[PDB]
Design a protein around this ligand. Sequence first.
Ligand SMILES: CCOC(=O)CC[C@H](C[C@@H]1CCNC1=O)NC(=O)[C@@H](CC(=O)[C@@H](NC(=O)c1cc(C)on1)C(C)C)Cc1ccc(F)cc1
Length: 165
Amino acid sequence: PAPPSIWSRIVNFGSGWGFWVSPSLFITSTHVIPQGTQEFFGVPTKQIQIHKSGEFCRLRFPKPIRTDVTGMILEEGAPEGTVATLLIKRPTGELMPLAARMGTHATMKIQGATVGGQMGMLLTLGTTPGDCGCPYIYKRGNDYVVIGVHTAAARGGNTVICATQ
Ligand SMILES: CCOC(=O)CC[C@H](C[C@@H]1CCNC1=O)NC(=O)[C@@H](CC(=O)[C@@H](NC(=O)c1cc(C)on1)C(C)C)Cc1ccc(F)cc1
């Protein structure tokens, strides 16, 4: 499960979703970002500072946009064995948190491409196309930590991939 504040940060972004780590820090997947728009949330792309590390896409805006959200902790993956939660929203509005025991951090070969991220293993419906960009989060003490965004889900198994950095 997750609090309603963490869920509010997830917003539709092109083919998938994106997560407001802070009023001005927006993370998403490289596969889902729209490649034809010169504006994001009314802010010109010329003012936005984008840094991409594989399928992890980082958007820094000049001004704060979502002043309602507190700034969370963003880190490169979670300790091996950490049971994280994949907060995937669906178009219908249904909320579908999935429990995923994170695993090895590594550079992977996904469909002939190279992706830095962390493997995960879903526990006990599943992920689908249009889910990339949704965040992985786990609770550390009393603080919430986001570790990456969804990127792929190997077929013939419950292996999921959490792009990082
Ligand atoms: C093209 C449409 O694009 C989208 O809509 C993005 C959403 C889907 C969501 C998947 C979709 C289903 N369940 C899910 O969670 N993502 C992808 O399709 C990715 C490919 C896979 O998931 C493949 N996985 C692996 O190759 C793979 C290999 C290992 C190892 O782990 N995963 C296939 C499962 C489709 C796209 C991709 C390609 C090359 C990369 F560098 C990085 C990413």
